[PDB]
Design a protein around this ligand. Structure first.
Ligand SMILES: CCC(=O)N1CCN(c2ncnc3c(F)c(-c4c(O)cccc4F)c(Cl)cc23)CC1
Ligand code: NA
Ligand code: NA
Lengths: 221, 213
């Protein structure tokens, strides 16, 4: 059957350049237009570019026109996307897709991930998300910790060295425009316990061999 | 430019429609196709030429086009249908393909639940590190689709916002998180900040203020 395989994705610094390739398999490559389509973290699909069967017609989304060049080599069954002047907003999974009759996409690759960041390995800073001053014995309180500005993924979070697991939710990370990740972990606890029980979030960042334990306590209000 | 509702849902065996709304340069005068997408997998063609089904797509998927809007209909819903749905089309004025914004189709499998919203102001420690992050944590909701908006006093804020995609908690409901990254000076130069969370046509807004704990 028809198969498509992207490659070339990875970590690249803003302003630099990167070349993606898409290899094609079960069809006459030179008879079809080919597209690039991308999906940025948490965003909808965004069409990137298309190139006609012989390359004499190319079209580009405005968001990449002038920076990206689509090309093809019909003798090697390969589609290319030359990305220049890369920006943080170009972080995305990039897909190639076969066109059918200038009408719809019919086959797609697996995708290749492109991360645009100037960052090197960097352990997190951990800040407390202290429980609301409006906590009264008889209710529950949300507290947590903000794990910020680390690179690369992942971070793991535990509470009270693994002793506290019920009511914990650790969120996925966001990649901030700075090129660094942040995430949060939150736990719901009895307000009754806030003046007696110690709550510590344990943040492990293996890529930097950093572990941070942060004590989260009520504010001075 | 081509817009779709963020979210639609119905129970297994029921039906939904998803419409995208364009203009004469795109939906009005051009082929419309529909795609099913579960992120991390490849989009799948459902409908082409506004109402044709490819081979292998069951007849419970159908499409129509009327004027500058196009509609995908799904009957006999099953959990394998839960995905993101996009319409795609050509815009003759821009000479570009445009995807609609995407609609998350939830096949209902548990009770609807409005979100709890917890809004943390910047910690004293982060402020002393010359940074200010507002942390909006959104929990215990279902379906797993929300829209988050931030307000400074009462004006929209778009710069410096990052929001995670909802994912499941231990109790099988959804949670999501949103961040507003401010300067300490941006933080202290407003009377309040708000996280507004829209879920199933209903909005929960939490407010914090630099002058109040
Ligand atoms: C290169 C030949 C040429 O001049 N043209 C005109 C514009 N142009 C298109 N005209 C009409 N419908 C189109 C169209 F439906 C698409 C398209 C597609 O091929 C695949 C998915 C969605 C799309 F809108 C694309 Cl990329 C281009 C179209 C490409 C063909
Ligand atoms: Na955790
Ligand atoms: Na769901």
């Amino acid at each position: 059957q028809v198969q498509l395989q992207e490659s070339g994705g990875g970590l690249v610094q803003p302003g630099r350049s990167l070349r993606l390739s898409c290899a094609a398999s079960g069809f006459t490559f030179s008879s079809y237009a080919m597209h690039w389509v991308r999906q940025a973290p948490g965003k909808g699909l965004e069409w990137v570019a298309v190139i006609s069967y012989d390359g004499s017609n190319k079209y580009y989304a405005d968001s990449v026109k002038g920076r990206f060049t689509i090309s093809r080599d019909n003798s090697k069954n390969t589609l290319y996307l030359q990305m220049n002047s890369l920006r943080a907003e170009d972080t995305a999974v990039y897909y190639c897709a076969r066109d059918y009759d200038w009408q719809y996409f019919d086959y797609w690759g697996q995708g290749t991930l492109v991360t645009v960041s100037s960052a090197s390995t960097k352990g997190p800073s951990v800040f407390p998300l202290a429980p609301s001053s409006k906590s009264t014995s008889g209710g529950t309180a949300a507290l947590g910790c903000l794990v910020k500005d680390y690179f690369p993924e992942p971070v793991t979070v535990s509470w009270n060295s693994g002793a506290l697991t019920s009511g914990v939710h650790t969120f996925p990370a966001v990649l901030q425009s700075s090129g660094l990740y942040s995430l949060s972990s939150v736990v719901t606890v009895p307000s009754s316990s806030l003046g007696t029980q110690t709550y510590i979030c344990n943040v492990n960042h293996k890529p930097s061999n950093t572990k941070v334990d942060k004590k989260v306590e009520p504010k001075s209000c | 430019v081509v817009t779709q509702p963020p979210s639609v849902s119905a129970a297994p065996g029921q039906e939904v429609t998803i419409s995208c709304s364009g203009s004469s340069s795109n939906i009005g005068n051009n082929y419309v196709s529909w795609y099913q997408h579960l992120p991390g997998t490849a989009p799948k063609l459902l409908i082409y030429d506004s109402d044709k089904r490819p081979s292998g797509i069951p007849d419970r998927f159908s499409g129509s086009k009327s004027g500058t809007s196009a509609t995908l209909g799904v009957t006999g819903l099953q959990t394998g249908d839960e995905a993101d749905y996009y319409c795609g089309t050509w815009d003759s004025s821009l000479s570009a393909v445009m995807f609609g914004g995407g609609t998350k189709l939830t096949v209902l499998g548990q009770p609807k639940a409005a979100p709890s919203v917890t809004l943390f102001p910047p910690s004293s420690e982060e402020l002393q590190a010359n940074k200010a992050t507002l942390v909006c944590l959104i929990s215990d909701f279902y379906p797993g689709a929300v829209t988050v908006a931030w307000k400074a006093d009462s004006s929209p804020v778009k710069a410096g916002v990052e929001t995670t995609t909802p994912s499941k908690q231990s109790n099988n409901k959804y949670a999501a998180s949103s961040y507003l990254s401010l300067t300490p000076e941006q933080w202290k130069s407003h009377k309040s900040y708000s996280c507004q969370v829209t879920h199933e046509g209903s909005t929960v807004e939490k407010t914090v203020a630099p002058t109040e704990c």
